[PDB]
Design a protein around this ligand. Structure first.
Ligand SMILES: O=c1cc(-c2ccc(O)c(O)c2)oc2cc(O)cc(O)c12
Length: 326
């Protein structure tokens, strides 16, 4: 299996571009940046609104928890490679504590509203707009040879007033190389593509399109997370109970994959549930044939069948957003 688009990006570029292990970091001044207030946290970092003391401008200070240096340089390399791309978070500086050497990444500040509060207020038009903005970021990183591998609302910062969106947390992102077998313990459970869940390791940028599909279903159906598995086995069961097992079977057969007996037994057999069965009084104003058609084209078991980010942006679902831009 191989990407249908941008498969040669890292092939054609100098090794300096994707060989992140050979990076030697230029450390800035730790004292340029002061923590103002904690805003976020996760397994690998803590995140603070900060102040650049030279120019009194806001910034984000992402303090990294202990991890292998390889992973730090990977995230730094990918951020440098993508800095300036549409809707990609801007890495501004890289600094460290002198005594403990704990690194922090300094980013542009985005005046975010949390998705659990923001999304329920978004009109049908806003959903189209912000998803279009997120697609610009994904097509860009894909075009630059990078898979994000952790698309989810928690990693999409939205300053709603300015209608500004940024794709953040590149800490699980990787360079795409034709034929490479990747770790499948990426993404957050509710957003893991079937490839991850059945152990297909030669995946590509299309993994992000599945994750975007999950985010999008959660928005239009007002069911967050859309596929709510308690563990990775359960996650595949939850998918199969919507897409149906006949489709899973064709998929597995195509890529010569068999499930673990325990996993196979848990998935069982399930008819496909048509998308309209998720419409209700709460989500009615958001669910249209174009939304459904676009969703259907993202949530396919076969990663090769999913729309690319570039095709996604051209879907008639976005035609109003494109017209506003043109
Ligand atoms: O502007 C924000 C920027 C970031 C951020 C930026 C880059 C990252 O690699 C990351 O992991 C988080 O994270 C936030 C997290 C928040 O809760 C609120 C925010 O405004 C931000």
């Amino acid at each position: 299996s191989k990407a249908r688009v941008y498969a040669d990006v890292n092939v054609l570029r100098p090794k300096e571009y994707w060989d992140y292990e050979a990076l030697t970091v230029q450390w800035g001044e730790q004292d340029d940046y002061e923590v103002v207030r904690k805003v976020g946290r996760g397994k690998y970092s803590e995140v603070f609104e900060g102040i650049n003391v030279n120019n009194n401008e806001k910034c984000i200070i992402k303090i990294l928890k202990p991890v292998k240096k390889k992973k730090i340089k990977r995230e730094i390399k990918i951020l440098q490679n993508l800095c300036g791309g549409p809707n990609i978070v801007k890495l501004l500086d890289i600094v460290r504590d002198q005594h403990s050497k704990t690194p922090s990444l300094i980013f542009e500040y985005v005046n975010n509203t949390d998705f659990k509060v923001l999304y329920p207020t978004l009109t049908d038009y806003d959903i189209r707009y912000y998803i279009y903005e997120l697609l610009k970021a994904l097509d860009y990183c894909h075009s630059q040879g990078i898979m994000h591998r952790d698309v989810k609302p928690h990693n999409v910062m939205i300053d709603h007033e300015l209608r500004k969106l940024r794709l953040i947390d590149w800490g699980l992102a990787e360079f795409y190389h034709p034929g490479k077998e990747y770790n499948v313990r990426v993404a957050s459970r509710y957003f893991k593509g079937p490839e991850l869940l059945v152990d297909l390791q030669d995946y590509d940028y299309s993994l992000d399109m599945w994750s975007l599909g999950c985010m999008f279903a959660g928005m239009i159906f007002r069911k967050e997370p859309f596929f709510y598995g308690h563990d990775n086995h359960d996650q595949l069961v939850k998918i199969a109970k919507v897409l149906g097992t006949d489709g899973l079977n064709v998929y597995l057969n195509k890529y010569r994959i068999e499930l673990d007996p325990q996993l196979e037994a848990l998935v069982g057999r399930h008819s496909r549930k048509p998308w309209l069965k998720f419409m209700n009084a709460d989500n009615q104003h958001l669910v249209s044939p174009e939304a459904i058609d676009f969703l259907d084209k993202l949530l396919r078991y076969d990663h090769q069948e999913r729309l690319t980010a570039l095709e996604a942006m051209t879907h008639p679902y976005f035609q109003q957003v494109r017209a506003a831009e043109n």
